[PDB]
Design a protein. Structure first.
Lengths: 14, 57
């Protein structure tokens, strides 16, 4: 999806 | 569950200083030509507090 960086997981941020 | 940060890369990173997911790593897009930074704004104080502080409480 995002061209470039990635996300570990759903990433819980409150 | 112990480390205060997670790498959100595709093949490699560079920076590592955050929370559970609030860390801003780098990503040498395994299938790319450039390396971008990961989002270290994911304030997973719960993941982190429960990651490092959760186990060694």
């Amino acid at each position: 999806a995002p061209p470039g960086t990635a996300r570990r997981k759903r990433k819980a941020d409150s | 569950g112990s480390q205060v940060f997670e790498y959100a890369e595709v093949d490699e990173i560079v920076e590592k200083r955050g929370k559970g997911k609030d860390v801003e790593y780098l990503v040498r897009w395994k299938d790319g030509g450039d390396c971008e930074w990961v989002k270290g704004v994911h304030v997973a104080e719960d993941v982190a507090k429960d990651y490092e502080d959760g186990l060694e409480y």
